[PDB]
């Protein structure tokens, strides 16, 4: 009771940027259409990603237009989460959670939820990578008087999973 209800207001596990991403191994109209799904899904114009090495194995050169991604914060990131999670039926099973406290997953098809199929736009899939934080995690990105966050203010994988179960009643670690 009182022994625990002291630090709750400022240690609360809060969802930071969603940083949704789509990567296509080529450029042009197909990539341009893949960009449009972000405005459909986020109402937020994404940015394009360039490749820095020419590998030629699967085929890409440097400074191409390869991937598009956007980062969503606030309530808009909140509902894009449960949109992707209800697609997954609240099932991230074992190890999608990183040791730094953030986790991610990938959806193969976007037309299921949300935006309705537009035959003009393609069949692209995408991967979400939600990062978690607490009030005070922004001092690492600050310009003046920057600093680390301290050991006991970090987020471990286990406490990230506890937050997911406590907030969405998710299912983690099937006995496999």
């Amino acid at each position: 009771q009182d022994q625990g209800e002291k630090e709750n207001p400022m240690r609360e596990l809060r969802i930071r940027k969603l940083c949704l991403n789509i990567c296509v191994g080529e450029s042009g109209d197909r990539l341009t259409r893949a960009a449009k799904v972000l405005e459909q899904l986020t109402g937020q114009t994404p940015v394009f990603s360039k490749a820095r090495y020419t590998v030629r194995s699967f085929g890409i050169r440097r400074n191409e237009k390869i991937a598009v991604h956007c980062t969503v914060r606030g309530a808009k990131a909140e509902e894009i989460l449960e949109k992707g999670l209800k697609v997954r039926e609240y099932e991230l099973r074992k190890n999608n959670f990183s040791d730094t406290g953030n986790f991610g997953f990938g959806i193969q098809e976007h037309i299921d939820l949300g935006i309705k199929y537009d035959p003009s736009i393609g069949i692209y899939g995408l991967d979400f990578y939600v990062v978690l934080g607490r009030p005070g995690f922004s001092i690492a990105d600050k310009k003046r008087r920057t600093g680390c966050i301290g050991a006991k203010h970090r987020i471990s994988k286990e406490e990230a999973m506890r937050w997911f179960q406590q907030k969405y009643d998710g299912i983690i670690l099937p006995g496999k």
Binding site: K143, R144, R145, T146, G147
Partner: protein
């Protein structure tokens, strides 16, 4: 047992630490060198700098010149000392930045004995004004603005203190480009919306925006404006009284309070005998607990 350690013993043996105020992220030593270093053929002439530091609760303005043993402050002004006349709530805003800049200018020239000369701009227009020295009288006090680590974009509060100090009579080189009046596209200085920021009119139209549209979100935003009834009206007037109150008395006085005990609020460093003792009874405790079995 899988990855090579980076911060190993050899890492710290040859790790060279940065300057302490660089580590704390408070001083930009690249800019500080160009800002405080005097020409070598002046030999004693101080390079006065106007330090403007805008804080979460306060605004700090001081004039300094750099010596070997450390900077020397000749006069400083604080936004938390503004409520002693006129404006009492609404600090750390652009209208507060101008006032503490003006207050800093006034109390400096008053201390130098040249307050009656270089009156600056008693009437306030948000336009270009640079003081000039008067022949036959001591020249204008010239100093340079130290924005620090703040990003100097158009309409930064660090330039609000510049306008206040230069309206007070300090000859600070600058341009009207980084003032709230300036318009990036047509490259013009409106200089009337600048004067609106100085008298806090942008905030004033913010409050009057909220009242008609909302009540509870209005008192959540301006909670302390409601106390003692700081209405959007008479907000230009209270800044005029603040500006005139600065001209009349800019002098600073502090308060005597020595009726304080000698309480220690930290814990003193443990001594060698305590440290040696502590490991000693840690040895026996481990051995006794082991032997209890």
């Amino acid at each position: 047992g899988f990855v090579k350690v980076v911060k190993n013993k050899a890492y710290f043996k040859r790790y060279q630490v940065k300057f302490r105020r660089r580590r704390e992220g408070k001083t930009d030593y690249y800019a500080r060198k160009r800002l405080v270093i005097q020409d070598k053929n002046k030999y004693n002439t101080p390079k006065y700098r106007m330090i403007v530091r805008v804080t979460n609760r306060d605004i700090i303005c001081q004039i300094a010149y750099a010596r070997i043993e450390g900077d020397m402050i000749v006069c400083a002004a604080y936004a938390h000392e503004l409520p002693k006349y006129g404006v009492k709530v609404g600090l750390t805003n652009y209208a507060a930045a101008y006032c503490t800049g003006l207050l800093l200018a006034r109390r400096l020239l008053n201390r130098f004995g040249m307050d009656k000369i270089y009156e600056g701009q008693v009437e306030v227009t948000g336009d270009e004004y640079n003081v000039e020295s008067i022949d036959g009288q001591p020249g204008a006090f010239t100093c340079y603005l130290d924005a620090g680590l703040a990003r100097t974009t158009t309409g930064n509060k660090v330039f609000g203190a510049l306008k206040g100090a230069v309206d007070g009579g300090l000859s600070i080189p600058h341009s009207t480009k980084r003032f709230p009046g300036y318009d990036s596209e047509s490259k013009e200085f409106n200089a009337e919306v600048h004067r609106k920021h100085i008298m806090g009119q942008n905030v004033a139209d913010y409050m009057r925006y909220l009242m008609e549209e909302d009540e509870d979100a209005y008192k959540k935003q301006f909670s302390q404006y409601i106390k003692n009834s700081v209405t959007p009206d008479m907000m230009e007037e209270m800044y005029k009284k603040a500006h005139a109150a600065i001209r009349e008395n800019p002098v600073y006085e502090k308060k005597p309070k020595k009726e304080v005990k000698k309480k220690r609020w930290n814990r003193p460093k443990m001594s060698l005998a305590q440290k040696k003792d502590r490991v000693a009874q840690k040895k026996a405790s481990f051995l006794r607990a082991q032997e209890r079995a």
